[PDB]
């Protein structure tokens, strides 16, 4: 723990906590250079987890008493209210003054309005008393803009506070655990309830507070909207009590998609997984044509789902702008029809009250109603899982262990106790031999003797500290020295005794950075016998009195093993109590004891002589930023330019139509008051407005805002559901056509990682995202338009705020980007710490280190909530200088139209200031859309840079053989060449070989001589160098399918494709069921599919898992037989195969390919030896090319020595039967 830079929140007034001053050297840093994990600042000491932790804890055990002495139901909500209860309505203070000052304001707004109207004369008292209205104004939206963020972030630090409390008790738990109800549950759901169950408590506290102060506004700002013109505010309010409920009946019916299309999405990801695992072998099958309609038959729903909720989505943000015009022509037409006058005193007073309880249940309050099950529904989930059980508590100066009729169950439903009767008693400097079968019990004593099995009868005695080693090598993540300390304190000769002991020389000699380098989870890098190798020496480091080996020998060889055994259990341990488990009975000899377990019970315990002369057998008890050609792309891939254009005119034509739409009212106040008036003074006329021509207009008017809606938020969607449908055939169809060596490039999890995250992103995610942003750009630049086209004499004090506003945006976000990857990078080092800790807690408890469990994690924990506080007050600095740019447009647009009074008639004074009034909640929500656009735009790469792929050639080039291709299959290889990449290692080096008419020439040689090479250059696989002749015709004039169907192989692996057997064995249906029926009983094969109810169409599994690997060969074997072509090839087909099966495949290919072309490429000698001709390949060059048995005369021969190798009577036997099939074939006569 070093002391770095603390927080400047404790050295700073209130002025620079509510500015946020103090996060100036921060940025100034981060601007200059790159932020990393050395630069951050400390949270408040005042609880970092314990302070947290322990608080929490102690009401929770304190609830026990309360829920003992009745015993009713246990509650664990009531303890998390009793806690922070206590300072809830200091906060709640703060909602009252703030959330009240938009109501009054329109109030001080109306009593400007109606001052025009007198101003006539020179008035300057009555602008001497308008002076302290037009300075309320100004001044009240001043707390409504720079205090709000401050409490913004006081609500949101309340909950990573329970979010920290919550997850530091969920931790400590899970050491006084019930392993028999472990072991009933599944170590997946303990760490998987970590990363959903905590971030919920971050959202509900915000939004939890406008409960009691959603309904309170829907009553005040009634009652004031009702002290208006009269009744006719009803007919207003009549739709928004029914337009709520009116969007939870979409809802309800988006649930029944969006769940139901998953069966299409889900189910071609997974098969891509098979197709795409062995590129290598379904390439030279000539099968892309059988598995692509595949794929296109799946991709032909998917799209047709989504659009069929792309416009029930794409309808409902139509309506949320075209609502604020619904409201307000409703009101009006049932204000005049009943006979009234109308004053522009009387109108912004309302329509600006017409969104302020408007945005308040309509987007402000659905969260307070569906973010509260959420968090409740993980309350009742943890409390039952912390109320499972708990363990019961336990614990002459001689250190030994004694063992007196112990029995004990693993089970209580078992009938059979796993120990029967065991007594035995060891003592310091014996070495106790625990032998016998698999599942005898061995494991289950040792841990007996650890005390984790619960005695039933008997009792057992130990004195001293025990070191358990298990049977499957546990490791946590660190270094080779702290696993083998263990926290214990480093001794140089110590360890270094330890190690020669325990022979870590040599892996510490292979390995780079010796014991100093990190080991991840399960120790991947290290192999098992290394891992128990450590294991083994960590136990002997700790220097205890009690050793229980759990099997640490049988995972290395016998030389390693017999050399730790001799240097460390006899030499080291000579003086320690040792019980040790092995299966191998040639370290008996050197134990002092040798107990036997069978079934439980104690056969016999003594010593290796006193076996020996009781004449029993071991043996047999043993035995069982984004530039614009990415936007420019994006937009060409959806459709021509032309609907684009006609996009931007509808969206011209549907904003216009929006300002203007507002201008009717004015014209319509601006005429009733203007003449109409003079009744009794000024003049005498009876006329008044035609109400058949100013109604009927409005209406006209008003009909051109839905209809307009619905036509633009319908196009949008579709294009970029479109672009997609064609962006995804344009890289799947040319993915499939790749050469072999790009494959081998890229691993599997990076190939198969671009076609399920970034393939769904640009459907649902990134049209609702970028729709947003193109609605609310129009919205803004309408609001500066209307304060400049009125008073020309803005626009000349409006440049260096909007030169400010650019320089400010790129100095923000040029170090946002830092703090964000930083806390994603520290965000979870907890998942690894809990999950390498509850698989082997057998051992983590029998050492007494309780006390270095929760400091560890604890450090852990200070890691990632020191990286949160930094993007939370991050998030609170830019939106804090962007509310200052805001809250002097309105003080420049009030007095600069008051000084100007003579020169309007509170039109355009009314007009101005309704407009520029709502400018502030609506230019923040703006800037944020563009930047997730910013940053949801950098994803998408992958998809268009795997669109201009390399091919190697058509799958047919030209003028097809005529239908006498092939024959007998003379093949010449003239000087063949074969590199597996352009300019790198040749394999194969002037390959010349002739091979005649029906011959049986097989290939032999040493792993990675070339002989896969071969055929893999037969099979034109990659461009050879040379000229590599068959059947008199060159390979390279001819296509690739042509010479892939007309040659069949039997591969090492034998590899089996889901679905039925008739799409395996003929997946174009080119035979017919008698020809595969007969080749199925030919292969003997009839009788075992037979008795399976579909043994046309068994859905076979995954690699076939069904099915044994002879099986499988045998499958192979019948598709070459179905196949019918004049070549065949065989490579290490018969090598994990069993010989009774094996030779049943080798009569199969003597009987049926009798008068073909075999290639024969296999391991074993056996056969080999009846080919006609061997081809010995060493370093990609042949070198002899004759009959096995001339061959074999020559002993400086390279295949005669591998002959020999075998043995002397398996190479006689060799020689012999090819002496046999010489005279056979060379001497018929
Ligand atoms: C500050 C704020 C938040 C906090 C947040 O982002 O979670 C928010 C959350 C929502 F679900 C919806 C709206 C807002 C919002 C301000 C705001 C709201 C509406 C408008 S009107 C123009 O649609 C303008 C601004």
């Known amino acids: 723990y070093q002391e770095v830079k603390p927080n400047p929140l404790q050295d700073a007034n209130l002025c620079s906590r509510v500015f946020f001053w103090w996060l100036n050297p921060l940025f100034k840093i981060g601007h200059k250079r790159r932020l990393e994990e050395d630069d951050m600042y400390s949270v408040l000491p005042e609880d970092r987890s314990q302070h947290l932790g322990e608080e929490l804890q102690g009401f929770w055990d304190k609830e026990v008493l309360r829920a003992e002495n009745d015993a009713q139901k246990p509650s664990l909500t009531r303890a998390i209210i009793k806690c922070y209860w206590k300072s809830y309505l200091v906060?709640?203070?703060?909602?009252?003054?703030?959330?009240?000052?938009?109501?009054?304001?329109?109030?001080?707004?109306?009593?400007?309005?109606?001052?025009?109207?007198?101003?006539?004369?020179?008035?300057?008292?009555?602008?001497?008393?308008?002076?302290?209205?037009?300075?309320?104004?100004?001044?009240?939206?001043?707390?409504?803009?720079?205090?709000?963020?401050?409490?913004?972030?006081?609500?949101?630090c309340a909950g990573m506070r329970l979010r920290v409390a919550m997850c530091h008790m969920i931790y400590r738990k899970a050491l006084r655990l019930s392993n028999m109800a472990m072991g009933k549950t599944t170590t997946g759901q303990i760490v998987n309830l970590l990363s959903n169950d905590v971030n919920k408590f971050d959202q509900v506290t915000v939004f939890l507070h406008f409960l009691w102060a959603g309904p309170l506004q829907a009553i005040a700002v009634t009652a004031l909207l009702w002290m208006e013109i009269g009744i006719s505010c009803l007919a207003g309010m009549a739709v928004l009590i029914i337009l709520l409920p009116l969007q939870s009946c979409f809802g309800k019916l988006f649930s029944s998609l969006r769940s139901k299309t998953a069966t299409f999405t889900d189910a071609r990801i997974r098969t891509m997984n098979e197709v795409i695992t062995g590129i290598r072998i379904i390439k030279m099958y000539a099968w892309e044509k059988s598995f692509s309609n595949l794929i296109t038959n799946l991709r032909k729903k998917e799209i047709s789902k989504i659009l069929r909720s792309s416009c029930l989505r794409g309808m409902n943000l139509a309506?949320?702008?075209?609502?604020?015009?619904?409201?307000?022509?409703?009101?009006?037409?049932?204000?005049?029809?009943?006979?009234?006058?109308?004053?522009?005193?009387?109108?912004?007073?309302?329509?600006?009250?017409?969104?302020?309880?408007?945005?308040?249940?309509?987007?402000?309050?659905?969260?307070?109603?569906?973010?509260?099950?959420?968090?409740?529904?993980?309350?009742?989930?943890?409390?039952?899982?912390?109320?499972?059980?708990?363990?019961?508590?336990?614990?002459?100066?001689?250190?030994?262990?004694?063992?007196?009729?112990?029995?004990?169950?693993?089970?209580?439903?078992?009938?059979?106790?796993?120990?029967?009767?065991?007594?035995?008693?060891?003592?310091?400097?014996?070495?106790?031999?625990?032998?016998?079968?698999?599942?005898?019990?061995?494991?289950?004593?040792?841990?007996?003797?650890?005390?984790?099995?619960?005695?039933?009868?008997?009792?057992?005695?130990?004195?001293?500290?025990?070191?358990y080693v298990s049977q499957q090598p546990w490791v946590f993540s660190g270094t080779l020295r702290s696993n083998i300390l263990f926290g214990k304190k480093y001794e140089k000769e110590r360890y270094?005794?330890?190690?020669?002991?325990?022979?870590?020389?040599?892996?510490?000699?292979?390995?780079?950075?010796?014991?100093?380098?990190?080991?991840?989870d399960r120790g991947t890098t290290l192999s098992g016998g290394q891992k128990a190798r450590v294991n083994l020496a960590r136990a002997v480091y700790q220097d205890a009195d009690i050793y229980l080996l759990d099997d640490p020998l049988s995972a290395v060889d016998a030389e390693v093993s017999r050399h730790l055994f001799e240097l460390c259990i006899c030499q080291i341990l000579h003086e320690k109590i040792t019980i040790?488990?092995?299966?191998?009975?040639?370290?008996?000899?050197?134990?002092?004891?040798?107990?036997?377990?069978?079934?439980?019970?104690?056969?016999?315990?003594?010593?290796?002589?006193?076996?020996?002369?009781?004449?029993?057998?071991?043996?047999?008890?043993?035995?069982?930023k984004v530039g614009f050609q990415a936007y420019k792309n994006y937009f060409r891939a959806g459709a021509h330019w032309i609907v684009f254009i006609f996009l931007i005119?509808?969206?011209?034509?549907?904003?216009?139509?929006?300002?203007?739409?507002?201008?009717?009212?004015?014209?319509?106040?601006?005429?009733?008051?203007?003449?109409?008036?003079?009744?009794?003074?000024?003049?005498?006329?009876?006329?008044?407005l035609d109400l058949n021509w100013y109604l009927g207009i409005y209406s006209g008017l008003t009909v051109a805002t839905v209809l307009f809606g619905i036509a633009r938020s319908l196009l949008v969607f579709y294009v970029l559901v479109n672009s997609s449908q064609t962006l995804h055939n344009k890289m799947f169809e040319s993915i499939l056509k790749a050469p072999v060596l790009f494959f081998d490039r890229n691993p599997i999890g990076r190939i198969l990682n671009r076609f399920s995250k970034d393939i769904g992103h640009l459907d649902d995610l990134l049209p609702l995202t970028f729709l947003d942003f193109?609605?609310?750009?129009?919205?803004?630049?309408?609001?500066?338009?209307?304060?400049?086209?009125?008073?020309?004499?803005?626009?000349?004090?409006?440049?260096?705020?909007?030169?400010?506003?650019?320089?400010?945006?790129?100095?923000?976000?040029?170090?946002?980007?830092?703090?964000?990857?930083?806390?994603?990078?520290?965000?979870?080092?907890?998942?690894?710490?809990?999950?390498?800790?509850?698989?082997?807690?057998?051992?983590?408890?029998?050492?007494?280190?309780?006390?270095?469990?929760?400091?560890?994690?604890?450090?852990?924990?200070?890691?990632?909530?020191?990286?949160?506080?930094?993007?939370?007050?991050?998030?609170?600095?830019?939106?804090?200088?962007?509310?200052?740019?805001?809250?002097?447009?309105?003080?420049?647009?009030?007095?600069?139209?008051?000084?100007?009074?003579?020169?309007?008639?509170?039109?355009?004074?009314?007009?101005?200031?309704?407009?520029?009034?709502?400018?502030?909640?609506?230019?923040?929500?703006?800037?944020?859309?563009?930047?997730?656009?910013?940053?949801?735009?950098?994803?998408?790469?992958?998809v268009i840079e795997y669109t201009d792929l390399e091919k190697e050639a058509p799958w047919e080039y030209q003028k097809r053989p005529p239908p006498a291709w092939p024959h007998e299959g003379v093949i010449i290889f003239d000087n063949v060449n074969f590199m597996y990449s352009p300019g790198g290692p040749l394999v194969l080096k002037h390959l010349t070989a002739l091979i005649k008419s029906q011959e049986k020439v097989g290939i032999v040689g040493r792993t990675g001589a070339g002989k896969s090479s071969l055929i893999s250059a037969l099979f034109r696989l990659s461009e050879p160098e040379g000229k590599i002749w068959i059947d008199k015709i060159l390979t390279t004039e001819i296509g690739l399918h042509d010479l892939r169907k007309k040659m069949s192989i039997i591969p090492q692996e034998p590899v089996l494709f889901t679905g039925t057997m008739r799409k395996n064995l003929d997946p174009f249906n080119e035979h017919t069921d008698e020809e595969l029926w007969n080749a199925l009983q030919e292969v003997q094969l009839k009788e075992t599919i037979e008795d399976l109810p579909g043994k046309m169409d068994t859905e076979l599994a995954e690699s076939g898992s069904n099915f044994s690997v002879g099986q499988r060969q045998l499958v192979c074997l019948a598709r070459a037989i179905l196949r019918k072509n004049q070549i065949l090839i065989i490579?290490?087909?018969?090598?994990?195969?069993?010989?009774?099966?094996?030779?049943?495949?080798?009569?199969?290919?003597?009987?049926?390919?009798?008068?073909?072309?075999?290639?024969?490429?296999?391991?074993?000698?056996?056969?080999?030896?009846?080919?006609?001709?061997?081809?010995?390949?060493?370093?990609?060059?042949?070198?002899?090319?004759?009959?096995?048995?001339?061959?074999?005369?020559?002993?400086?021969?390279?295949?005669?020595?591998?002959?020999?190798?075998?043995?002397?009577?398996?190479?006689?036997?060799?020689?012999?039967t090819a002496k046999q099939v010489y005279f056979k074939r060379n001497y018929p006569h």
């Open 1131 to 1216: 490579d290490e087909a018969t090598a994990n195969v069993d010989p009774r099966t094996d030779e049943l495949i080798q009569k199969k290919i003597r009987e049926k390919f009798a008068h073909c072309t075999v290639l024969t490429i296999a391991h074993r000698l056996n056969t080999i030896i009846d080919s006609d001709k061997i081809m010995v390949l060493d370093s990609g060059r042949l070198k002899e090319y004759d009959e096995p048995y001339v061959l074999l005369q020559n002993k400086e021969s390279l295949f005669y020595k591998m002959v020999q190798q075998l043995g002397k009577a398996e190479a006689a036997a060799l020689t012999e």
């Open 319 to 467: 309506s949320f702008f075209s609502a604020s015009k619904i409201i307000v022509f409703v009101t009006f037409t049932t204000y005049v029809l009943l006979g009234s006058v109308i004053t522009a005193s009387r109108v912004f007073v309302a329509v600006t009250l017409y969104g302020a309880v408007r945005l308040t249940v309509t987007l402000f309050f659905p969260s307070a109603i569906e973010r509260v099950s959420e968090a409740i529904v993980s309350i009742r989930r943890i409390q039952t899982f912390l109320l499972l059980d708990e363990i019961s508590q336990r614990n002459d100066g001689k250190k030994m262990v004694h063992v007196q009729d112990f029995t004990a169950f693993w089970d209580k439903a078992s009938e059979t106790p796993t120990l029967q009767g065991l007594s035995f008693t060891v003592r310091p400097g014996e070495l106790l031999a625990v032998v016998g079968p698999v599942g005898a019990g061995k494991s289950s004593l040792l841990s007996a003797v650890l005390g984790e099995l619960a005695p039933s009868h008997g009792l057992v005695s130990v004195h001293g500290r025990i070191a």
């Open 649 to 688: 005119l509808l969206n011209t034509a549907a904003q216009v139509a929006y300002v203007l739409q507002d201008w009717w009212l004015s014209y319509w106040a601006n005429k009733q008051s203007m003449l109409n008036v003079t009744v009794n003074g000024g003049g005498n006329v009876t006329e008044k």
């Open 774 to 942: 193109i609605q609310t750009l129009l919205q803004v630049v309408g609001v500066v338009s209307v304060a400049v086209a009125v008073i020309p004499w803005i626009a000349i004090p409006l440049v260096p705020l909007g030169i400010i506003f650019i320089f400010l945006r790129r100095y923000f976000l040029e170090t946002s980007r830092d703090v964000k990857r930083l806390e994603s990078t520290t965000r979870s080092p907890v998942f690894s710490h809990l999950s390498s800790s509850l698989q082997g807690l057998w051992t983590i408890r029998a050492y007494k280190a309780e006390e270095r469990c929760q400091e560890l994690f604890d450090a852990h924990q200070d890691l990632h909530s020191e990286a949160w506080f930094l993007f939370l007050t991050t998030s609170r600095w830019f939106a804090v200088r962007l509310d200052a740019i805001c809250a002097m447009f309105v003080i420049i647009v009030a007095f600069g139209s008051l000084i100007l009074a003579k020169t309007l008639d509170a039109g355009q004074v009314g007009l101005a200031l309704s407009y520029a009034l709502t400018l502030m909640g609506m230019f923040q929500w703006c800037v944020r859309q563009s930047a997730e656009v910013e940053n949801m735009m950098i994803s998408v790469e992958r």
């Open 496 to 520: 270094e005794k330890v190690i020669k002991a325990c022979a870590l020389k040599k892996d510490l000699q292979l390995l780079e950075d010796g014991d100093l380098t990190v080991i991840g």
């Open 91 to 156: 906060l709640g203070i703060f909602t009252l003054i703030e959330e009240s000052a938009k109501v009054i304001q329109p109030i001080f707004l109306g009593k400007i309005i109606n001052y025009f109207e007198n101003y006539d004369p020179m008035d300057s008292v009555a602008l001497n008393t308008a002076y302290a209205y037009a300075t309320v104004l100004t001044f009240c939206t001043l707390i409504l803009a720079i205090l709000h963020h401050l409490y913004f972030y006081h609500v949101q």
């Open 580 to 624: 040790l488990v092995t299966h191998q009975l040639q370290y008996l000899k050197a134990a002092s004891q040798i107990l036997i377990l069978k079934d439980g019970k104690m056969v016999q315990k003594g010593t290796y002589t006193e076996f020996l002369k009781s004449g029993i057998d071991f043996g047999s008890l043993l035995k069982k």
